[PDB]
Swiss-Prot record, chain C:
Protein name per the record: Capsid protein VP1
Role description: Forms an icosahedral capsid of pseudo T=3 symmetry with capsid proteins VP2 and VP3. The capsid is 300 Angstroms in diameter, composed of 60 copies of each capsid protein and enclosing the viral positive strand RNA genome. Capsid protein VP1 mainly forms the vertices of the capsid. Capsid protein VP1 interacts with host ICAM1 to provide virion attachment to target host cells. This attachment induces virion internalization. Tyrosine kinases are probably involved in the entry process. After binding to its receptor, the capsid undergoes conformational changes.
Positions spanned in the full protein: 584 to 640 of 2179
Location of this chain's protein in the cell: Virion; Host cytoplasm
Species name: Human rhinovirus 14
Known partners and oligomeric status: Interacts with capsid protein VP0, and capsid protein VP3 to form heterotrimeric protomers. Five protomers subsequently associate to form pentamers which serve as building blocks for the capsid. Interacts with capsid protein VP2, capsid protein VP3 and capsid protein VP4 following cleavage of capsid protein VP0. Interacts with host ICAM1.
Swiss-Prot record, chain H:
Function: Forms an icosahedral capsid of pseudo T=3 symmetry with capsid proteins VP2 and VP3. The capsid is 300 Angstroms in diameter, composed of 60 copies of each capsid protein and enclosing the viral positive strand RNA genome.
Superkingdom per UniProt: Viruses
Protein name listed in UniProt: Capsid protein VP3
Location of the protein in the cell: Virion; Host cytoplasm
Source organism per UniProt: Human rhinovirus 14
Complex and partners: Interacts with capsid protein VP0 and capsid protein VP1 to form heterotrimeric protomers. Five protomers subsequently associate to form pentamers which serve as building blocks for the capsid. Interacts with capsid protein VP4 in the mature capsid. Interacts with protein 2C; this interaction may be important for virion morphogenesis.
Amino acid sequence: TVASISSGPKHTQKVPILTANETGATMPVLPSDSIETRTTYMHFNGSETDVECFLGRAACVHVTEIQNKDATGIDNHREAKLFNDWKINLSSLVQLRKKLELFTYVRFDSEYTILATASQPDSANYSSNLVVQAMYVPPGAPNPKEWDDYTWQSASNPSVFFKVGDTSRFSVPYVGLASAYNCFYDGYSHDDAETQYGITVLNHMGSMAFRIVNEHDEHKTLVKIRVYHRAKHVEAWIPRAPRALPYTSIGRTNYPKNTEPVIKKRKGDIKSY
Amino acid sequence: TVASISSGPKHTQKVPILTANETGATMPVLPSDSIETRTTYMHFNGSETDVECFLGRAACVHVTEIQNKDATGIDNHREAKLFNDWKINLSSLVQLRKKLELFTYVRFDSEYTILATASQPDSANYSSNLVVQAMYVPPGAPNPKEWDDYTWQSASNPSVFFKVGDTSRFSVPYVGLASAYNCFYDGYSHDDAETQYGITVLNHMGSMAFRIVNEHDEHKTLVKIRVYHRAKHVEAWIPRAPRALPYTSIGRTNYPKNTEPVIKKRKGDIKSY
Amino acid sequence: TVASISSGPKHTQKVPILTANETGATMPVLPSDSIETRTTYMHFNGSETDVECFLGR
Amino acid sequence: INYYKDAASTSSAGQSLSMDPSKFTEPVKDLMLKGAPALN
Amino acid sequence: INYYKDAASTSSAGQSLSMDPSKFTEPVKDLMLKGAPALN
Amino acid sequence: INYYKDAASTSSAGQSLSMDPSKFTEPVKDLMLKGAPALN
Amino acid sequence: GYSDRVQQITLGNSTITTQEAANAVVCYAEWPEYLPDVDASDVNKTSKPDTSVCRFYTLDSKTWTTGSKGWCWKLPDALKDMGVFGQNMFFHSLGRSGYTVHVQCNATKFHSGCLLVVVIPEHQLASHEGGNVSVKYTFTHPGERGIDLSSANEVGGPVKDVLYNMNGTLLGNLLIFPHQFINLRTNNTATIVIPYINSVPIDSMTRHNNVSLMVIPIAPLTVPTGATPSLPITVTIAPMCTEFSGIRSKSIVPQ
Amino acid sequence: GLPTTTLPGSGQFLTTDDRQSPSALPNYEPTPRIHIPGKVHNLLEIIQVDTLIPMNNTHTKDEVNSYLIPLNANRQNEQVFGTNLFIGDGVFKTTLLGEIVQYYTHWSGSLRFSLMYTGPALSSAKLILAYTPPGARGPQDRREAMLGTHVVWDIGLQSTIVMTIPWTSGVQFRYTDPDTYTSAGFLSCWYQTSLILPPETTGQVYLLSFISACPDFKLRLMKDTQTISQTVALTE
Amino acid sequence: GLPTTTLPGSGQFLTTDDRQSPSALPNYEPTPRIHIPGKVHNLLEIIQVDTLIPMNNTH
Amino acid sequence: GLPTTTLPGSGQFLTTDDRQSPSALPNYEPTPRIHIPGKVHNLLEIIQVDTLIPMNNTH
Ligand SMILES: Cc1cc(CCCCCOc2ccc(C3=NCCO3)cc2Cl)on1
Ligand SMILES: Cc1cc(CCCCCOc2ccc(C3=NCCO3)cc2Cl)on1
């Protein structure tokens, strides 16, 4: 492939460099339209800018935490982090979010990796070996109330059991209801006067919910869960302007008030170098 | 292959042993040009002197250390070794360095092995099990500030998570900007009067930066990281004189003052055996 | 596979929507027996409702 | 590839792709045609 | 070799090697030739 | 068998078995024959 | 003698002529088309009023003055009240449509000024409150009036800051969306053909707008000496290939 | 039982590796795809669309005005604007090009810089745009500027001028984050003759300026952008 | 000895995965199947049989 | 699931072994090679060039 062809002096009536940008086109002008060039080859394919590659590496999408401790007398397991959850989403944390929102609709399979590490902030004789159980409670399923409810039987709901310190990995097909996931949605769930706007209304997909299977030892053990997400088989439509201001909320486009100028001011003139 | 052919008495006008070294050549003289020889075969190929073999074994290129401890009240994580880094380089430690600098330009893929072991120098009930996370912050990426910054999300930057005591291994293609890496560079980054000289100006490739993912336990744990590097697919150009004096700096050729004579003095005469 | 065929106005002596449930049958009535439909395809096989799948986790 | 000798040890079965609701939806002795009168 | 039955479980896809910027760079209704005048 | 997609991930290269010292041992412009006088 | 410059668009019972055009943009290089069966889901036969809905509606005019910040209309909202297009809209459960948008602004060879005319698929607005305040319905359904970016923040309304496109992105990059400029010195109209863009084959026309049309002054209007300091901008829009499906009782929407 | 040996790296999680995994939802059937205009395949497809450069960066809070380069009637010989070409920083940084370049470590290729004139139709002007390849200082006067890559632009019916910064380089890749060795030059613009307004007209006229990449362009070695960060996870 | 590398997920138990296992009862012979009317293959077969709706829910 | 047995040496790191590894930079394209005079393939090539001997070591 040639990156530049050889081209010499020109004295024409045919001027490729004068255009009318009002038309909305970006005319494909090249170095050889306005200087004299020599042949050179590309030596490159643009492999690593493919959208599959761009969205295809694991990104941290969520960090949560649960603890193993005596539940005796706990009136609210959920509240003691005897177990927890994450009503799923991927707007949660912002590095991957800016990448996805370069597109309007996106379609892909997900590969999740879940790393779990334990901490024992206060005096323990040892480090126990805990097994985590992460189950996905698809909306409608009967969400779970104590850390050892009938829910955890998970007879119809996919669940994975792995050890703290290890990693769990599995992959979920594209579960969207439509043909693509909306990265943006300028609508409502119905025409009510006070219903919510954006896409937190469309991105209702239950949520994964973790717990330790082990009963309690004499000390307490903090287990912190990190969920990583990798898109595989990516398809993206309609590019948009990149995010300039900071994010404030999962699912709304809102930016913070009295934010700071995002364009760097010159130290000098327009004329400055 | 014959290592020596059979050759007998000679009384010629054709003298292969008289030459003129002023020409710059090393004339290919053999035993059979000046004594009577018998046939013998080589029985050998020179396999283990191939440059791929010479530069192809893992060498320790870096030892760093980070600790897991309560960051509560630490004003400078980087400074507490809550995490660290290594602005990469391979002049760092000298065994592999002398080997590479036998050549002027070198091109190869790298295979890294990272061994991490833990130490608990002061009273602990136990040994905790820590997961290390090593990410590569290519220059320009927003380098990381606390041990748990958004940076560690590493949504676009390759990172590996492995356990202390284990080893991590992965391989990075030849990332040089030119066609080869310069082992030497007699230039500057521009024609300023005070800019730096050598190659620390050319070998700007960010740096890898490690941390423990675990929160803190009651005791403190020292984790010491050793990075090993193995060249694979090696290509080397222009041999040079081997390094004689000791090294003083990454990237400059400078040797120490009042160094010692590097040529061993005879215990005796020129005539001595 | 078609999920619905195209069907238009009807003025017949042949009424598929009147039945006698006392018989014990569930007559296979479709949208196109009582409204005007357009063609659409199924795009689906019913894979995940197989009893092997239902009892297989 | 089965690595094991016994049939019980093989993985899940593969979709019936059988599907015939008529034993349940139309177990009538004399065939009913949709469109023809139910009771003649 | 896929070891798994479902398509979601396969590795990353392979490069589009599609590449056609004209839907974005030249969505004009009447074709513009480089070198010819923009507005006639 | 390569298990990985990228070339950097393959094992070490295999012996040049190239070997030609003359660029280093005899870079002279006019060819010198062993046995003939060095300087004529 | 055809110029890129003169054009005629006849759609239904209405025709537009421009003698100073700058080509026309067809979003993503695709022209509006009906919904194919292979893409269909709802089993209902759809209704295609054709020429009674696919004609040109001219919205009420705006006034560009030296202080203008820009205006924003949403589709199909802007047309919610135009003739039979609008009736069909409130009466069917689902509908689908593409449009021809023609923005008009003429001046003289002594004026200067340049407007950006851009179509943004799925333009989800931001609340000026920050945090996770929502933007109420009424605020994103201004109707033919559209939203006036130089109007004041209101409560439950969107933010109207132009350097941020009403969503946290910079004005400068709106050029990645199908768009055309109106530069008084060149141009006097902008025309964009919009194909139907959605993640579902057909949708509700009232709970979801699928494009915002935005006209933004970028090089300020500068009139000749002692000229009146303003110009009107007119927007005329025509639904094209419209289809409605799932007819019934007639939606009732807030406010 | 087949004998195996495990190698160094066993059990590691590399966020960039690409392997198979069990599906959690065996046998599930995804929604059919329908057609949607606009599919993107390569980021290289989109960085060829031009977007506006806030060249007039001299303000103090972001404003529509930093996109406008002003021009003065009747000045002769003088300089319209100047900038270095660190596409990952400074004016370029918020543009789509700048914004994507920042996801990669290295770039190589030609850039296309165009200027669209917005002055009254009855005015006229001749400007010179100059590209100065690495190695010299930003030009200080047109004489200096005109000795490097340049285009005399004659403002006419055809409203825009497209200047190309042809790839001039020793090293075949430059770093996107500004680096010296790897630096690309300067871009300046001066009056060639001068802007002239018709009667009954007055004041400043402005140029809009765009940037996009030529088909020439290469970007490699993905990394994280300095353009976005956060201090606590967001919630709904 | 063939060189291997284990990936993330090793040792996990996913209740939905489908693999082979050793039989605890090697060589055992199950009872023959006889014919039984009524076999169900898909839940889609049975949701087409109609059943009564307690529409008058007001009690 | 295929039955395996691990041998002595599993998990060891031998600095001299030569195996495959995942690439951290999937799909990256290295700079083209240009021609450079002087390529060395074997250390045996270079030890045939003669160099001076500090024979007079007595200093
Ligand atoms: C954009 C965008 C991205 C997403 C998230 C999609 C999540 C799909 C469902 O997620 C899961 C399904 C199953 C499991 C699971 N099954 C057994 C263990 O975990 C986990 C998750 Cl996160 O939603 N919108
Ligand atoms: C000579 C010479 C040798 C070198 C060093 C080359 C280093 C290349 C880049 O290094 C890395 C890239 C990625 C990773 C990495 N990705 C995920 C984990 O580690 C690590 C390193 Cl050291 O530079 N000059």
